[PDB]
Nucleic acid binder design. Sequence first.
RNA 1: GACCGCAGCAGGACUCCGGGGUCAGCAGCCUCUAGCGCGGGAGCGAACGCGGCUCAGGGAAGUCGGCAAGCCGGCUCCGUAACCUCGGGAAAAGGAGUGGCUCUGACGGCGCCGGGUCAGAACUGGAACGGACGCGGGGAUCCCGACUGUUUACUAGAAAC
RNA 2: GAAUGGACCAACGAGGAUCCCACUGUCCCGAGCCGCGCCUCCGCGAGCCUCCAGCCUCGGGAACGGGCGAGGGCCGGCCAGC
RNA 3: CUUCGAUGUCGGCUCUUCCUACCGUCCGCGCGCACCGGCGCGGAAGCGUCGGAUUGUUCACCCGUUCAAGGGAUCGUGAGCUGGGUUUAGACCGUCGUGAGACAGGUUAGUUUUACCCUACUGGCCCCGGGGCCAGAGCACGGCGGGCCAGUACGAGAGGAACGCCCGCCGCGGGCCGCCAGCCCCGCGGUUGCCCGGCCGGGCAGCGCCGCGCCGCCGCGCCCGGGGGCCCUGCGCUGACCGCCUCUAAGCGCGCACCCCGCCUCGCGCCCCGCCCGGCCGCGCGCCCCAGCCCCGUGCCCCGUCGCCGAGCGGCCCCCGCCCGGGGAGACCACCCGGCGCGGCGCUCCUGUACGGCGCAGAGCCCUGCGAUCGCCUGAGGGACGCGCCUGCAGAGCGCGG
Lengths: 63, 372, 134
Amino acid sequence: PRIEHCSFCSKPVYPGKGICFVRNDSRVFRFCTSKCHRNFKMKRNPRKVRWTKTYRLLHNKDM
Amino acid sequence: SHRKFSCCRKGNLGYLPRKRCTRGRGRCKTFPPDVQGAPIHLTAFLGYKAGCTHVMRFIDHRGSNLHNRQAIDQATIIDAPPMICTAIIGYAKTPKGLRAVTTVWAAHIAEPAMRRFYRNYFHAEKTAFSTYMKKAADGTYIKEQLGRLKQHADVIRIVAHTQPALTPLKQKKADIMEIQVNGGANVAEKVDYAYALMEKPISIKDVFSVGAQIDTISITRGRGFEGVVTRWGVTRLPRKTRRGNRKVACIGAWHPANVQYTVARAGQMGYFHRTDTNKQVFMIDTAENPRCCTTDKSINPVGGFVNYGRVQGDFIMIKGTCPGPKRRPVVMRNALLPHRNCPPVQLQWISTASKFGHGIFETVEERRQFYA
Amino acid sequence: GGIGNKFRISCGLPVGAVINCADNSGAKSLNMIAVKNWKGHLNRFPKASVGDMVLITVGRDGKPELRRKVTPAVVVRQRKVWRRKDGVWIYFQDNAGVIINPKGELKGSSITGPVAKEAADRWPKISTTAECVH
RNA sequence: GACCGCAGCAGGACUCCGGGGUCAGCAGCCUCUAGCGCGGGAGCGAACGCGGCUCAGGGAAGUCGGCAAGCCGGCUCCGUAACCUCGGGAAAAGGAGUGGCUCUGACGGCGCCGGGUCAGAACUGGAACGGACGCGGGGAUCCCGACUGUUUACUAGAAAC
RNA sequence: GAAUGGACCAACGAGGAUCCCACUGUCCCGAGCCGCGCCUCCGCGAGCCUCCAGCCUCGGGAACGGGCGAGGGCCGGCCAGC
RNA sequence: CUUCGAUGUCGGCUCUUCCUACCGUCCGCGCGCACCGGCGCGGAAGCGUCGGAUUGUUCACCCGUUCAAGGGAUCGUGAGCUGGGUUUAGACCGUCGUGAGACAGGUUAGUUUUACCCUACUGGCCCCGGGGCCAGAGCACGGCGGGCCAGUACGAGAGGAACGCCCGCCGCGGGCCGCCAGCCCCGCGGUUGCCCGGCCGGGCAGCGCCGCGCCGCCGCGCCCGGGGGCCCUGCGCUGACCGCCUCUAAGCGCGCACCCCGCCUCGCGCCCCGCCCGGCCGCGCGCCCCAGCCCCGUGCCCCGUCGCCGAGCGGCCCCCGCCCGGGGAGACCACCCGGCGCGGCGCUCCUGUACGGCGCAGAGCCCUGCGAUCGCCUGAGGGACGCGCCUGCAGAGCGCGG
């Protein structure tokens, strides 16, 4: 089907699941779940949350 | 003096008494109109609510904004294993209403039907139908009694029994339901069609069609003794009210001197018979087909249907919601009067992700690649 | 002045809400006096959604001419999440609105920030003026 | 722990002695010693009540009235107005920091041994630090009484005395 | 209306007012939860009331009756709520 | 007049019902009705009559909006609440009084007790098969807009309809949980003080606090609500009385958001069937029409009073377990299920990378001693109340009714 990536988690969100948030900067941040969202609003770096793709990419785990 | 500010009564009084349903499962109460000389068809089927999924659909509704647009809509899967027809009841409409002429049963009734007839099958004496199987099985008895139905009946119905062994339910006793045969050119055409189905399985695929509307009929989820604010929707009083805010402050006026039936009172909320009408069938399919929901994706959610089971076999996805919790029996009838302006179904996706937790994988194999 | 039959969306801004200005009209903050097309029910505060024309008053923050008057406005951004029938659940960082006449002309030349499609479909001038529809 | 109040009544009863840790603390919280398991128990986890929590978006639109709740709060450094009997106001208003480590500095008696406070710096941790606890919300005015005091035990703490 | 004291408010106030900012389930509009009560059981066990009786509608009547006139309902016994 | 050995005393909140003397919506008809609008009238009480500033206020008044009738119910509504008003005792001020005090002048401060009884109502119960059928009782879809019509009829312009069909929305109603928010029972992570010697892992601070969070509830989310009948007020048809005319007098058509019915909610009884298929009882059928009334204005007149067989029809009665365990059900019961379950094993999801080991990490100090942290093994470990399985222990009364 058609998917989007969490702006924070970077894990694919299938149709019908998630929230989209429009920043004043004019960027649109699609979110996987309230946890994908709350981590971002609380300004917690994605590169320090181990489950997040950015940490997996940082550790060389995913790409 | 007057209320001073117009406001409606909270609650429908046609759903009164709000009592726990005495009827065992949802009953059909009325059946779709007979219609003379239509194609011969069966009016209802019994099923068990499995879960809900959410589907992407292409909406061809001209005049709606969503015309040639895409919509994610909730849909309810109801497991419907084939039902064995076991009998044929004919009712003659009389001055006193429909009065049954006779019900003719098959020479062999399966164990789940017999189980319904006894409280504990193991300690039961197992005498039901014992003389009848001997009187039947000669062939002549059934025909002579079916002949009585042809001559003296107008409303021919088939008595069917669900097979609980093909379901994840712990029941073990077959829900027995009468289903009307509608559309015969003559009464004798209905009884003859019924005899073809006697002692034989009937499936949802024959009974209903995709795009058609069905009236779900079921007993609702129960919440037990509940207060007026939850049961009837009355406004909670201000926080400082001594004796609490969760009550109707005046249950009436000095005159009439008795509390009225229309005044909200605390009592049973839930477990009431309710019919939901005009629900369109998104799809009828089998879970044995590996690609039923693929537009491999079969109907089973990854992780299984929460609080339900494996949905093995025939299933129907209706759009929207049905009364009752999961596991509950739902009788499903052809809509008495259908919403004419409903768009035709074009399912483009069905969600198969875990409804247990927030799953992000449609299939177990996708999860296996992800967690390498 | 709204063009079309909007599908119902969750209304996050009740009477008393102070929505921010999305235009260079000169108002900084707009207070919601009331909602147009509203037949209410007893005790229900009038509530408004993105794309809904509201009557607003401009507070002491705004330019003097704008102050002291009930003026028509449309809500263009809401914090409350709402579900479009496509299934998208969308929310914006702030609650903001544009001063516009009921006919549709806007007091200010510019609109700032993303503006919801609901506002832009219902009001054409909103679509042309706004930089982004999200 | 037996007194006095109907009683072996969450009522009222004058003293003496008073460890540790966190702390400015005889505060709160936890404890050593000592005392000790309170007109009973089980089951259930309805409504409703009482004692507490949490709540999206809005933010007093509720109401006689912001009642009740919440907000604020410790310390250190800045930064503080009108008015004013020049004493105040004032913790005005408003900010910023705060942990854990690893170390530096200063401060005495004077071979050598204290003290636990003050600064300053690295380096660290989902963007976290008075981490529980304890613990002003603030401001602009109007009336009245100058104030601190006193008051109808058992419905009026007030502008009354 | 001027020691039946007049006017004047710095500082003080569990005093009486009006507003503003922050703040919140006060409200829109309620929902979920944790204890304890309730509830059921074992054991203990009262108070207060009480001519009788214990369903209504209308009429007439100390002008607003449970009993009276004429209608309409109603096996009998309980429980939790109110 | 009735109540003073006491019927609690305004407004608000909350909640139901009722009326019509109808404001909007509906149906007709009339206008000084071109249209749009207004306005008068008859039927019509189904729905709607809202959010706010001041006031204790009903009222008043103003602002707003889908533009906003009026009332009754012991001036509905205190063992429902509030105490704001009112109306005790404290206290001011003004007037009045020699004074004590007064005020139908203002101001402020001021215990709102009791259900466990009867009734009513709301659910629940008093063991007795499966399917159904219907007496009675309840009852629920209104309003507003957009689009096409249509810038059209109409107006010689400005303006500006309609029927129909379609799409939405509001208010309501009944459900539901896939999403998305709330919430989280004992899950995982973080952290404070004190305690268990330190580490690991814990406990206490009545869930210490914070971050997520499953199942399940939930709304702020989602789904669903399209119909018939008789007909008022009337407009018409044929048509008289009343050598005409006429909707009416016979006759007839159409006809309202109202009413009745359906659908829906409950349901006493009954029905069919199954097990069982057994007794007991009764003895009697033309039809129409009344201005054809087709031959009338009779008959029966004995349910014991001699009638009682059978046949055939019509009846009537009989008949049908619990405990226990779980639940999708629950106060207790009831309901719905039933050789449960308990413990594992997978899957799925929740949290966020376990202890330990390691290091070519680490501000350093200094000394091969310490060091918060760091990466690696490690999307790890821990957890589960959902799904699939059982490889292990188990599990269906000789208990009570019958």
